[PDB]
Structures are given as C-alpha cells and as structure tokens.
Amino acid sequence: GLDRGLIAVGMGLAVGLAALGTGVAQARIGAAGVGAIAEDRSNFGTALIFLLLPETLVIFGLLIAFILNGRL
Amino acid sequence: GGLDRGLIAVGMGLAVGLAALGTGVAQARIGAAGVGAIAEDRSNFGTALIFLLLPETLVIFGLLIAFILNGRL
Amino acid sequence: GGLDRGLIAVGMGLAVGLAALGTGVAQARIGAAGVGAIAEDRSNFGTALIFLLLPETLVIFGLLIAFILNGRL
Amino acid sequence: GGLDRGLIAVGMGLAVGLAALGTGVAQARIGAAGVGAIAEDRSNFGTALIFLLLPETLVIFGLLIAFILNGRL
Amino acid sequence: DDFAYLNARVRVRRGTLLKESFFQEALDLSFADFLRLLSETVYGGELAGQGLPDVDRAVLRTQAKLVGDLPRLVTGEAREAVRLLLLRNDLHNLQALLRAKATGRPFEEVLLLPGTLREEVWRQAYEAQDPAGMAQVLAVPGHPLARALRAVLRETQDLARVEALLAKRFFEDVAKAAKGLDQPALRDYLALEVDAENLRTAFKLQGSGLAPDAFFLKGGRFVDRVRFARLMEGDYAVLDELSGTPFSGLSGVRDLKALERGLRCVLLKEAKKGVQDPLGVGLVLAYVKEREWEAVRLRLLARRAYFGLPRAQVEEEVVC
Amino acid sequence: MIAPMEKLVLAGPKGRAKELLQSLQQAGVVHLETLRPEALSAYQLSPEERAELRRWEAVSAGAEHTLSLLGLEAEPARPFPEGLEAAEKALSPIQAHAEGLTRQKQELEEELALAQAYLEPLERLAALAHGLDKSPFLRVIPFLLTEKELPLVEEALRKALEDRYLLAHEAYAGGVAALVVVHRKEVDQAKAALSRAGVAELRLPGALGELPLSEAARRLKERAEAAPRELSEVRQHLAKLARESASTLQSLWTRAQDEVARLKALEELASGRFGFALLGYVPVKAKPKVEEALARHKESVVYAFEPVDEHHEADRIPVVLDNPPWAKPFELLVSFLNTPKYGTFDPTPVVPVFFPFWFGMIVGDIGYALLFYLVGRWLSGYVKRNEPLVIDLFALKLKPQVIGKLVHILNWMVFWTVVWGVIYGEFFGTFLEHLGVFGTPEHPGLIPILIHRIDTAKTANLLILLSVAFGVVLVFFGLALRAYLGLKHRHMAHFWEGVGYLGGLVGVLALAASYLGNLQAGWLQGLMYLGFGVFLLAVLMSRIWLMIPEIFTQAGHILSHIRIYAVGAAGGILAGLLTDVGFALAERLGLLGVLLGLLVAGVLHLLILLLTTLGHMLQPIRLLWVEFFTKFGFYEENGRPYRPFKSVR
C-alpha cells in the first residue's frame, strides 16, 4: 500500500487544474457578458449560453476524477 | 504501510486551492465589470449578482472532490 | 517496488488538467471577441459558435492520452 | 512494474498537456483577431481559418511523442 | 477592461463606412442627389426632413450614437486608454461654458455638442460659488480635465489667462497620460498630434512676435524650442528641414490653408496605421479618426452640393 | 461540376431594348456585364426615365416604410400589371391612414405616459391650492421630492419668512409635495436658495407644465379618462388596416422592386443612336429557356451564343455548382466559405462521400441515433407545415427549403451513426448491461461485437491506424487533385508544389513507419530514396521557396486526423460511464429507487448531449475545411458569385 495516495493527488490535480482552465475562460466571457447586459437587457440568453458553454472543462475533469475513483 | 494519508490529503488540498484559484481568476474580471455596471446604474443589480455567483459551481465541485477523498479517508 | 499505478495516474491527471488550462486560455479571448461580435448584431451567430467550439480539440486529446493510460491501469 | 512504467507515463502526459497549453496560448490571440476580421465582413473566412489552424502542429507533435512513448513500453 | 470585446464592436462598425467611389461620384451633383445618396447609408437613420440643419443634426446625432458609445462598454484600463481620443469635444464645451460664465450671457446660450460626459453635469456645473466646486462636480475620477482644471485653477476664479493655461495644461496632460500607460500605438500618435498642434499654432501666430516659449509646450518630439522660434520668425527652410519625419510632402508651405490641409492629411495617414495592432488601442484609433475625416468630408461635400460651388474649389480637399 | 457558362451577346433598337430586357428579366437566368470601352457610349439612360426611376424608388421606399410602420415584414408575392398612377392611388390613402395613426397614437402614448406618472401629485397640489389657482401675489413653487428631509429644503424658507410663507408637504408619500408660497420675488429668491439646497419646479411639457395647475389637472383627468379607449380603438383599426391592406401593398412592393431592378440594370448596356448591344453570361442548362424567350422579339433579334473564352483571362466569369441531386443539399455547407474561379474543381461531392461517414465514427450510440431520428421526423413535419423557422433568442428566421436540406443531411447522417452504433456496439451509451445484447467473452449474452471501444488494449492501436489511414487517403487525394488542376491550366508551379508535397509526405511517412515502427528496414528505404529525391527535384526545378517549413505542417495535417477516434472514445466512454453510474447506483442500491437513478442519468445524459454534440458535430467538418479544402487551393481570388435577373416573385 504505497501508490494509493498518488492516484488521489492525480485526481485532485486534474480537478483543480481543469477548474483553473475554465475559470480563465469564464473570466473574459463573463466580463463580456456583464458588459452586454449593462448595455441592454435584450442579450440575456446569449450571455448565459456563452457563459455556460466552457463547463466542458470541469465535466471532463469530473470524468477523470470518477475514473480514478472507480479504480480505487 | 504509510505514505497514503498524507498524499490523499495533499491531493485534497491541491484540488481545493487550485479550484479556488480558478474561480478567483474568473470573479476578478467578472466582479470588475459588475462594479462598473453598478457604478453606471443601480437597475442591473440582480443580474450582476447572478453573473458574479455563477462560478460558485467551480468551488462546490472542488469541495465535492475534497469530501469524496475525505470519505475515502 | 510498488511505484506504478499512482504515478501513471498522476501522469493522467496532469495531462488532462494542463490541456484543460490550454483550451481555457484559448476560449477566454475567443469567446470574448465572440460576444463582442454577437451583442452588436445577431447575424454573427454560427460564425462565432464555430470559433468558440474550435478549441475543444485540446481537452479531448488530453482525454485520449488519459484513456490510453486508463487502459494501462 | 516499478518506477519505470510510472515515470514514462508522466513524461508522456506532461508533454501532451504542456504542448496543449502552448497551442492554446497561440490560438487565443489568433482566434481573437480572426473573430474580428470575420466580424468586419464575411469575406476573410478562408484566410482566418488557415491562419487560425496553423498552430495545431504543436499538439500533433505532442501526440507524436506520446505515441512514441506508448509504443516504447 | 478587455480590449478585444470593444475591438470586436469597433471592427463591426469599421465594416460599415463609406467608400471612395461615393464622394468621387458625389463630387458633381445638386444636393437632391445628395439627399438621395444619404437616404440609404447608416447616416440616414436619423435624417428627419431635408435641408442643412436636418443634415447637420443627422450627422451629429449619428456620430454621437455610433462614436460616443465606445467610451462606455468597457471599465478600467480600456476606457482609460480609449477615452483619450474623443476628448476635444469636452474641452470645447468646457471653454464655451467658461467664457459664458465669464461673459454673462445666459446658460441656455450655447448649443453644447455631446462629448464624453452626460449633460446633467453641465446643467449642474454653472452655479458654484467656487470654480473649484465646478471642477469638483465636473470630476469623473480619472478624467484629464478633472485634474487639469483644478491644477491651473490655483491662481484665480474666472479669467481668460486661466483659459489659455487650461489649453496648454490640457495638451501636456493628455500627452503625459499617454506616456503614463502602455499603448505603443497611441503614445506616438498623441505626440505627433500635439507636435502638429503647436506647429500650426506657430504658423497661425506668425508676424506678431510675442514671447513664443510661453506658448510652446512639451510632449512633441519632431520640434523643439529653437525650431519653434525660427518658425515663428519668417524663414521656412526649417519647415523644409523636417524630412524623414512623416511630414513628407509638406515643404515650402506658407499659408494657413495648405498647411492645415497637409497636417490633417498626415494625421489621418499616421492614424490609419492602427491596423498594425488589431488587439490593442490602434484599431479604435483608426476607426475614430477615419470616422471624423469621413464626417467632415461629408459635411464639406454637403455644402458644395447645396451652394453649387465649383468642383475645382473642393478637389484639393478630398486628396487624402 | 461547374456549368460551362457560355456568353450571350444581343443587339437591336432601344424600345425593343427595354421590351427584351423585360422579357429577359421575367425569365431571369442570365448574368450581366458592363461592355464599355469599344466603339460605344456609356449609355446615359434618359432624363424622363431617370425621373421615372427615382419616382419608382420613392414608391418602393414609401411602401416598405409603410409596411415596417404597420409592423409586419416584407415578403414578396405575385405582382400585378396596372398603371403607375393607379399604383399611386393604391399606395397613398393607406399610407396616409397609417401615417396619421402612427402620429396620433405614438404622441398619445407620449401624453399618456407623461400623464399617468404625475396625475396624483398634480391633483394633490390642486386640492391643496384651491384657494389660489393663479392669484397675482404669490407663486406656488412645487417640488415633488424625496422622503423625510423636509427641513433640509425648508431651510431656505426659514431664511425666508418663518412666521409666514406657507411651505410644506401634506401627503402622498411616494413623493413629498413640497409646495412653497410667499410672494413673487421672495418665492423666487427662496426657490433659488432651495435649488442650492436641491429643488426644482414642475415645468413639464404638454399642458401640465405650461398652464395653471387647476385646469391642467382637469385636463390630465380628461386624458386619463379618455386615452385607453383610443388605445384600444387605434389597435383595432391598425389590425383592420393590416388585414385588408398588407396583401395589395406588398404586391405593389414586389412590383416596385421589379421595376427598380429592371431600370437599374438597364444602364448596363451600350448604345449610340440607331441601336444597342449588351453582353451576359448564361449557364448551359438555361439555353433553351433563353432561346425560346428571345424567339419572341421583332425578327428574332440576333443572338451570339459564344462558347466562353478559356481559363486565361478568366476571373470575371460567374460560378455555380450544378451537383447531382443526391449530393445537392450540401451546397450551403460548402458555400459558407468562398466560391471557386470557373476552372477550379467542384468540391461538393466529397463531403457526402466522407462527412456523415466520419460523424458515424464520432457518435456510435443507437440512442443518439433514435433521438436524431425523432428530431428529424419533427423537423420534416415542420416542413410539411410549411412554416419558416423562427427563434428570437438566436434571431434565427429561415425558409423551409434550407430546412428540407437539413432534413436530407440529417437522414443521410443518421444512417451512418446507426451503422457505427452497431459496429461499435453501444445502445444509448450502455444498455447492454441487463440484456446482454452485444457479445464480449467477459459476458457473452447475444450477437458479437466488432470492436469494444471502452478498453484500449483491444481497440486503440487499430482505431488509431485507421484514423491515420483516412487522413492518408484524404490528403493524398487532395494533393493529387491540386496536381491535376495545375496540369489543367498549364501553370507549372502548382504542379511542382503538388508533386513535391506528395513526394516529401510519402517519404516522411515511409521513414517514420520504418525507423520508428517495425523491423524489415530493407524494402521501404527505396521508397524513402524516391520520396526525398522527388522532393529535392521539386525544390530545384521550382524555385518556389518556403515549401520546406510547410512539409512539417503538411505532415501535421495528415496526422491531425486522430481527433475522430479521440472524440469518439471521449463521448463514448463518457456516455457509458454516466449510464454505468446511473444504472448501477439505481439498480444495486435500493431496487425501487431505480426510476430515480434512471431519470437523473437520463437528464444528465441529455445535458451532455445538449452541451457537447455541437462540438463533436463541428469536428469532422473543420477537419474537412482545414485539411482537404486548403490542400488543393480554394482560397484564391474569391471567384465571382452568380446572381441572375431576380424578378423577386
């Protein structure tokens, strides 16, 4: 029993670093969304769909985390 | 055998910290544009709060991974 | 002797996370210019969704290497 | 297996993730200027696509080194 | 904050401008064809009736709707870098209100074309016991006038020497604010513009002989004190000395008209270079100065079309 | 295959010019040309026809402005042959009706919006000031102000007469009606001091802030009691005006667009005084229609059906596509990009022969195929209903012919995703768990599987070799096609670049497969000889330099076809893992919360459907668009788009 921790630090590294990636994405996309909403109310749905599009990153990170959980 | 509790703990802490870094980088520019919109007018307050509090999903997912590791511990 | 499964798994996680950071860095500015083209007129819709969905090759290449590693794990 | 199989895999995955980070850094600014040039008029499409997808040689090189290391074990 | 967000909108708006064949075919008509050709384009969105105040109100309203939006839509460093392009209007409105307060003619006297500030500030900023209070209610935070008027307000309350030092302080403050941040295509532009400004000031103050170094500023690079003095006194080989600089075909020019024509052409040429930086501030610069060139050329073609002037009177003024 | 696009030259007299341009514009299958420089004038049209042209354009602009004022959108119909002043008598009364009503009701809404927001403070100060309506001794400074800070504004009244000078706010706490009344000059100076403390007088537009408050409040009561009746009646009359004017006004709009199009194209001719001549371009499958249409005129005025001059000096030629109808509905999908140059290869059949077959290898779920078949039958019912598809969220309005093309591509795609859901063996992710319908030897229940795709020791090397092999076929076909098109036009640099990239790429592939692949380093080394010898021969007999850095990116483009297997394994095991978690944690934990796990796995499965099928739908077509289309050129000088005489109909 020695490698049981290193699978978990790989799990946590994948989760945290993919969270960092989509945080970097949602920074600029949410800034543009808040700018478009501060222009008019009529750009609500496009701001929500462009903001919720980069969650592919974290759901793939949860995929890798649950791979490494289902192994252990 | 040893050298497993510490390593699942550093995975836990690294996950929580690095997801916190991700939503910090997000909420930096999102809250900057939000405070600019609030300084323009008070009408758009609730939409500014909902675009600011959308990236809490990141950290509740990070705490999910942390608590899965701790229940494994 | 037992230093195999954990180290191939942290290689898996490192590949996935770091490629994820790569396509996040890409989609940040591309989605910013995309919303800047959308919120002027809604005729640039498909020709901004193509550029937003274009950098999603990076995480799936990282997932390719991850799934090969899971096959060897 | 030992330390061999574990460490060749992280040498694979680090290469894949880090080359993906490189092409994300490239395609961020190139996609920003491309979405710009398209948003002027729908005429620069055949040149925005080739200048946008010139940097993917990096991640196919990362996958090349990865498959060399996969066949290496 | 984000330069690319504003740059996308600015590139969309740069996609819709007027071509060269427009005025090249509008160089000979009789003002009804002018109303015809302006019925289609984006300036026709605010054209109410017909005639010269209708066309002028349409051009000013479309320019305020299509240009005065981009000082908004960003927050922080991006608006601090883009607000220093369309800021001549605020100086003109402020000096008009300054001379109106120093004259006594009523507050509803001037017409007050829009700059970068909302007009409620202007309505509030006439009654103040202290002109420092007027500068305080005028103050939006990082504004150049908000820290220039209180800078050269430190002598009196309301004079005209205050207005002259206001103009000089404005020019040097805009140049220093261009130097104070990192935009590699706007610092050189504002240096070349303020060089053009005090050069044509020296041309339009020839023959007087008053103290030039009180009028000469700092912030340009192509001229200095000795060229300014030897240009105020009458020998023009120094104006012929400026070669290698973008003042290229401008040599041996004496009168004010051909001078200002050459300066406006070299400013629009060096300001059309801003597609060099398709991410920073150069593209919105190359949009705004091209837009004002197109607006004033549209105005001059309107005047010729209405009053039936010869095309030989206008041919030199569409050269660039 | 691009149509051969012959030339059509006509001539004759000028009344017959307008008449034959009418008869050519009714059967609108011809493109135009300037034909200036030789022996003819530029044809300044006529002064009276110029007046008629600008009057017709005024008719068109007024009709479309009346229509957009009415609120509907401008669709064509069939036109009507009738006189011009009859069209004036059709246009002008409905224009006068709708223009007077859109003056009346919009200014009514202005007056009603300024009235309803300020009825009750005005009526309140009227009931408060019913002892002085317009008495000539003391002005009534009104200020509808904020909450209980009345001493801050009444400090000016304290500086005024304190034992006098009645100034207060009685009631209506939405805005405190601070009224001030002393005198004329006293109230003026105290109003100045109160404005220094912050105050403003009720000086509004209309009748309230321009007259005395009693009669103005009575007029505001009148407008408040009258205006919604006119709201309802003017909506009813605009609805009637729509329902019995829109047909004839958009019919005359179609007529006006036809007349403006004909007269503005009439200046594209060349004439002097006893005749004209014009030139145009006709696709070869339009020759009998134009021939029978131009058989009508005077003595069958002389046509010149020239076979078009060849690929030299050929950039002004219009281009069409002309594909067989099995490959027809991908013309929009290949025409998002630019157009060829009439002498460039027709690129359109390879996307039916490749793209749905690649998308099958992307999506190998029978449940995804069944959901696509459901939305396809929905969308074919939508073109049965003949409605244009509209959504204001995306501002997507589009006509049902594009939607029928979308039906065709969706059916021709869903067949290949069915067959690659069969071969890959995945039903809705993984519903082979309970009913072992797909045969692996770890749980053989029923019919076998061809490749398992969930593990990689059995799948990954074979699938990755086939994924490279499709790119090998595609890129070698593209470079051979560029060499063909260089051989066609007698332009030699394209031929050398094609054969050079082909030789260098096959040399790099042979050296890779030998020195990094298997053993037997004997046979392939002569192929390395041949490949690099051809590459050096091309660079020497070319002098077309900077191909040497391109060959690395060229190997990049032949090797970047990994992504079909990449997103295939990604989406496949993602769906399989989601239905695995849902099915296992539902069944083997509780046995009756199985519907709970089933529907939450279903809704998360449809969530990842809705959230990444856009991306792994977009991946094969960008693979085509940035490998295959850019190998053989396709990005040079943009061609010239064929638009005929419209006759908008």
Short mmCIF file of N, CA, C and O in Angstrom, two decimals, chain F residues 424-487:
data_model
loop_
_atom_site.label_atom_id
_atom_site.label_comp_id
_atom_site.label_asym_id
_atom_site.label_seq_id
_atom_site.Cartn_x
_atom_site.Cartn_y
_atom_site.Cartn_z
N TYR F 424 -19.60 -0.44 -33.43
CA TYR F 424 -19.02 -0.14 -32.13
C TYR F 424 -19.80 -0.78 -30.99
O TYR F 424 -19.25 -0.97 -29.91
N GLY F 425 -21.08 -1.09 -31.22
CA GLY F 425 -21.88 -1.82 -30.25
C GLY F 425 -22.21 -1.05 -28.99
O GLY F 425 -21.81 -1.45 -27.90
N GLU F 426 -22.95 0.05 -29.12
CA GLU F 426 -23.37 0.83 -27.97
C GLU F 426 -24.81 1.28 -28.18
O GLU F 426 -25.09 2.02 -29.12
N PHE F 427 -25.71 0.84 -27.31
CA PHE F 427 -27.11 1.27 -27.33
C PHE F 427 -27.32 2.29 -26.22
O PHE F 427 -27.35 1.93 -25.04
N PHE F 428 -27.48 3.56 -26.62
CA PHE F 428 -27.78 4.69 -25.73
C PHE F 428 -26.69 4.80 -24.65
O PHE F 428 -26.95 4.90 -23.46
N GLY F 429 -25.44 4.73 -25.10
CA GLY F 429 -24.35 4.57 -24.17
C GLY F 429 -24.10 3.11 -23.90
O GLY F 429 -23.40 2.45 -24.67
N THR F 430 -24.66 2.59 -22.81
CA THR F 430 -24.53 1.17 -22.47
C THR F 430 -25.84 0.71 -21.83
O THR F 430 -26.04 0.88 -20.62
N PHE F 431 -26.74 0.17 -22.64
CA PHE F 431 -27.85 -0.64 -22.17
C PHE F 431 -27.70 -2.10 -22.59
O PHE F 431 -28.69 -2.80 -22.79
N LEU F 432 -26.46 -2.56 -22.73
CA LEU F 432 -26.20 -3.98 -22.87
C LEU F 432 -26.00 -4.65 -21.52
O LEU F 432 -25.66 -5.84 -21.49
N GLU F 433 -26.20 -3.92 -20.42
CA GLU F 433 -25.88 -4.45 -19.10
C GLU F 433 -26.91 -5.48 -18.66
O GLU F 433 -26.55 -6.61 -18.30
N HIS F 434 -28.19 -5.12 -18.65
CA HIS F 434 -29.21 -6.08 -18.25
C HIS F 434 -29.42 -7.13 -19.34
O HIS F 434 -29.20 -8.32 -19.12
N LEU F 435 -29.84 -6.69 -20.53
CA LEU F 435 -29.93 -7.58 -21.68
C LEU F 435 -28.58 -7.58 -22.38
O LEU F 435 -28.22 -6.60 -23.03
N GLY F 436 -27.85 -8.68 -22.26
CA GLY F 436 -26.53 -8.77 -22.85
C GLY F 436 -26.58 -8.93 -24.36
O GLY F 436 -26.25 -9.99 -24.89
N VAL F 437 -27.00 -7.87 -25.05
CA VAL F 437 -27.27 -7.97 -26.47
C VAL F 437 -26.01 -7.98 -27.32
O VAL F 437 -26.05 -8.43 -28.47
N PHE F 438 -24.88 -7.52 -26.79
CA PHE F 438 -23.65 -7.38 -27.55
C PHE F 438 -22.59 -8.29 -26.95
O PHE F 438 -22.32 -8.22 -25.75
N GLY F 439 -22.00 -9.13 -27.80
CA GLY F 439 -21.21 -10.24 -27.31
C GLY F 439 -19.72 -10.01 -27.17
O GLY F 439 -18.96 -10.09 -28.14
N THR F 440 -19.29 -9.73 -25.97
CA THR F 440 -17.92 -9.82 -25.49
C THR F 440 -17.75 -11.10 -24.68
O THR F 440 -18.69 -11.53 -24.01
N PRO F 441 -16.58 -11.75 -24.70
CA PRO F 441 -16.44 -13.02 -23.97
C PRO F 441 -16.43 -12.88 -22.46
O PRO F 441 -16.46 -13.90 -21.77
N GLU F 442 -16.38 -11.66 -21.93
CA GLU F 442 -16.47 -11.48 -20.49
C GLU F 442 -17.90 -11.61 -19.99
O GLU F 442 -18.11 -12.08 -18.86
N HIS F 443 -18.89 -11.25 -20.80
CA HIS F 443 -20.29 -11.62 -20.57
C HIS F 443 -21.00 -11.88 -21.89
O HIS F 443 -21.75 -11.03 -22.39
N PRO F 444 -20.79 -13.06 -22.50
CA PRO F 444 -21.47 -13.34 -23.77
C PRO F 444 -22.94 -13.67 -23.60
O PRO F 444 -23.30 -14.74 -23.11
N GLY F 445 -23.80 -12.73 -23.97
CA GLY F 445 -25.23 -12.96 -23.92
C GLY F 445 -25.87 -13.20 -25.27
O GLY F 445 -26.67 -14.12 -25.43
N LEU F 446 -25.50 -12.39 -26.25
CA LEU F 446 -26.10 -12.42 -27.59
C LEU F 446 -25.01 -12.10 -28.60
O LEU F 446 -23.82 -12.29 -28.32
N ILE F 447 -25.43 -11.67 -29.79
CA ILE F 447 -24.64 -11.43 -31.00
C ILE F 447 -23.35 -10.65 -30.74
O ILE F 447 -23.33 -9.77 -29.86
N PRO F 448 -22.25 -10.96 -31.42
CA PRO F 448 -20.95 -10.42 -31.03
C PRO F 448 -20.78 -8.96 -31.41
O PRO F 448 -21.60 -8.35 -32.09
N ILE F 449 -19.66 -8.40 -30.94
CA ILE F 449 -19.29 -7.02 -31.19
C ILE F 449 -18.04 -7.02 -32.07
O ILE F 449 -17.25 -7.97 -32.05
N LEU F 450 -17.90 -5.98 -32.89
CA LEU F 450 -16.75 -5.92 -33.78
C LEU F 450 -15.53 -5.30 -33.11
O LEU F 450 -14.41 -5.75 -33.34
N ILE F 451 -15.75 -4.29 -32.28
CA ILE F 451 -14.68 -3.64 -31.53
C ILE F 451 -15.31 -2.99 -30.30
O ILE F 451 -16.41 -2.44 -30.36
N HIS F 452 -14.62 -3.11 -29.17
CA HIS F 452 -15.26 -2.85 -27.88
C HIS F 452 -15.27 -1.37 -27.50
O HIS F 452 -16.22 -0.93 -26.84
N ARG F 453 -14.18 -0.64 -27.80
CA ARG F 453 -14.07 0.82 -27.77
C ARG F 453 -14.05 1.40 -26.35
O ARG F 453 -13.73 2.58 -26.15
N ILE F 454 -14.32 0.58 -25.34
CA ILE F 454 -14.26 1.04 -23.96
C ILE F 454 -12.88 0.79 -23.37
O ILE F 454 -12.34 1.64 -22.65
N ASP F 455 -12.28 -0.36 -23.67
CA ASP F 455 -10.88 -0.60 -23.36
C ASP F 455 -10.00 -0.14 -24.52
O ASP F 455 -10.47 0.12 -25.62
N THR F 456 -8.69 -0.06 -24.26
CA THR F 456 -7.75 0.40 -25.27
C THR F 456 -6.75 -0.65 -25.71
O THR F 456 -6.15 -0.48 -26.78
N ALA F 457 -6.53 -1.71 -24.93
CA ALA F 457 -5.60 -2.75 -25.34
C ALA F 457 -6.13 -3.52 -26.55
O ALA F 457 -5.34 -4.06 -27.33
N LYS F 458 -7.45 -3.58 -26.71
CA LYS F 458 -8.08 -4.24 -27.84
C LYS F 458 -8.39 -3.30 -28.99
O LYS F 458 -8.42 -3.73 -30.15
N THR F 459 -8.55 -2.00 -28.72
CA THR F 459 -9.12 -1.07 -29.68
C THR F 459 -8.13 -0.06 -30.24
O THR F 459 -8.08 0.13 -31.47
N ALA F 460 -7.30 0.53 -29.38
CA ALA F 460 -6.72 1.85 -29.64
C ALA F 460 -5.74 1.84 -30.80
O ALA F 460 -5.74 2.77 -31.61
N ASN F 461 -4.92 0.80 -30.93
CA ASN F 461 -3.91 0.80 -31.99
C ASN F 461 -4.55 0.62 -33.36
O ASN F 461 -4.19 1.33 -34.31
N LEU F 462 -5.54 -0.28 -33.46
CA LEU F 462 -6.26 -0.48 -34.72
C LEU F 462 -7.05 0.76 -35.12
O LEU F 462 -6.98 1.21 -36.27
N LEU F 463 -7.81 1.32 -34.17
CA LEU F 463 -8.59 2.51 -34.48
C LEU F 463 -7.70 3.71 -34.78
O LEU F 463 -8.05 4.52 -35.65
N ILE F 464 -6.53 3.81 -34.15
CA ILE F 464 -5.68 4.95 -34.41
C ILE F 464 -4.99 4.79 -35.76
O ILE F 464 -4.77 5.78 -36.47
N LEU F 465 -4.75 3.55 -36.19
CA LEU F 465 -4.15 3.34 -37.50
C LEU F 465 -5.17 3.62 -38.60
O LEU F 465 -4.82 4.20 -39.63
N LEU F 466 -6.43 3.24 -38.38
CA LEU F 466 -7.46 3.55 -39.37
C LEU F 466 -7.76 5.04 -39.42
O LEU F 466 -8.03 5.59 -40.50
N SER F 467 -7.70 5.71 -38.27
CA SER F 467 -7.89 7.15 -38.22
C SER F 467 -6.77 7.90 -38.92
O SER F 467 -7.02 8.95 -39.52
N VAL F 468 -5.54 7.38 -38.87
CA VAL F 468 -4.49 7.97 -39.70
C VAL F 468 -4.69 7.60 -41.17
O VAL F 468 -4.39 8.40 -42.06
N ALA F 469 -5.23 6.41 -41.44
CA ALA F 469 -5.35 5.93 -42.82
C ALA F 469 -6.37 6.75 -43.61
O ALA F 469 -6.18 6.98 -44.82
N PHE F 470 -7.44 7.19 -42.96
CA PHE F 470 -8.39 8.08 -43.64
C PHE F 470 -7.76 9.41 -43.99
O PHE F 470 -8.02 9.96 -45.07
N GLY F 471 -6.91 9.93 -43.11
CA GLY F 471 -6.18 11.14 -43.44
C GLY F 471 -5.17 10.94 -44.55
O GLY F 471 -4.93 11.85 -45.34
N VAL F 472 -4.59 9.74 -44.62
CA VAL F 472 -3.68 9.41 -45.72
C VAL F 472 -4.41 9.45 -47.05
O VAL F 472 -3.96 10.10 -48.01
N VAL F 473 -5.58 8.80 -47.11
CA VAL F 473 -6.40 8.78 -48.32
C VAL F 473 -6.84 10.19 -48.69
O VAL F 473 -6.71 10.61 -49.85
N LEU F 474 -7.31 10.96 -47.70
CA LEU F 474 -7.82 12.31 -47.93
C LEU F 474 -6.74 13.25 -48.44
O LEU F 474 -6.93 13.95 -49.44
N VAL F 475 -5.59 13.28 -47.76
CA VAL F 475 -4.55 14.23 -48.12
C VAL F 475 -3.88 13.83 -49.44
O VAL F 475 -3.55 14.71 -50.25
N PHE F 476 -3.71 12.53 -49.70
CA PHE F 476 -3.14 12.15 -50.98
C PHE F 476 -4.10 12.43 -52.13
O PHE F 476 -3.65 12.84 -53.21
N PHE F 477 -5.41 12.29 -51.89
CA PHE F 477 -6.39 12.68 -52.89
C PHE F 477 -6.37 14.18 -53.14
O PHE F 477 -6.46 14.62 -54.29
N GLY F 478 -6.19 14.97 -52.07
CA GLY F 478 -6.14 16.41 -52.23
C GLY F 478 -4.92 16.90 -52.99
O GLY F 478 -5.01 17.78 -53.85
N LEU F 479 -3.75 16.32 -52.69
CA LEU F 479 -2.54 16.74 -53.39
C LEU F 479 -2.54 16.27 -54.84
O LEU F 479 -2.07 16.99 -55.73
N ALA F 480 -3.08 15.07 -55.09
CA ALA F 480 -3.25 14.62 -56.47
C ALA F 480 -4.22 15.52 -57.23
O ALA F 480 -4.02 15.79 -58.42
N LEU F 481 -5.24 16.03 -56.55
CA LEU F 481 -6.19 16.91 -57.20
C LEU F 481 -5.59 18.28 -57.49
O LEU F 481 -5.88 18.88 -58.53
N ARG F 482 -4.72 18.78 -56.60
CA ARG F 482 -4.03 20.03 -56.89
C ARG F 482 -3.06 19.87 -58.05
O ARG F 482 -2.92 20.77 -58.88
N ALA F 483 -2.40 18.71 -58.13
CA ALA F 483 -1.53 18.44 -59.27
C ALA F 483 -2.33 18.35 -60.57
O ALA F 483 -1.86 18.80 -61.62
N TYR F 484 -3.54 17.80 -60.50
CA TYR F 484 -4.43 17.76 -61.66
C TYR F 484 -4.82 19.16 -62.11
O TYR F 484 -4.79 19.48 -63.31
N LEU F 485 -5.17 20.03 -61.16
CA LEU F 485 -5.59 21.38 -61.52
C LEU F 485 -4.41 22.23 -61.99
O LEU F 485 -4.60 23.17 -62.76
N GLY F 486 -3.20 21.91 -61.54
CA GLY F 486 -2.03 22.56 -62.11
C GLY F 486 -1.71 22.05 -63.50
O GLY F 486 -1.23 22.82 -64.34
N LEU F 487 -1.98 20.77 -63.76
CA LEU F 487 -1.80 20.22 -65.10
C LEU F 487 -2.83 20.78 -66.08
O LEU F 487 -2.56 20.84 -67.28
#
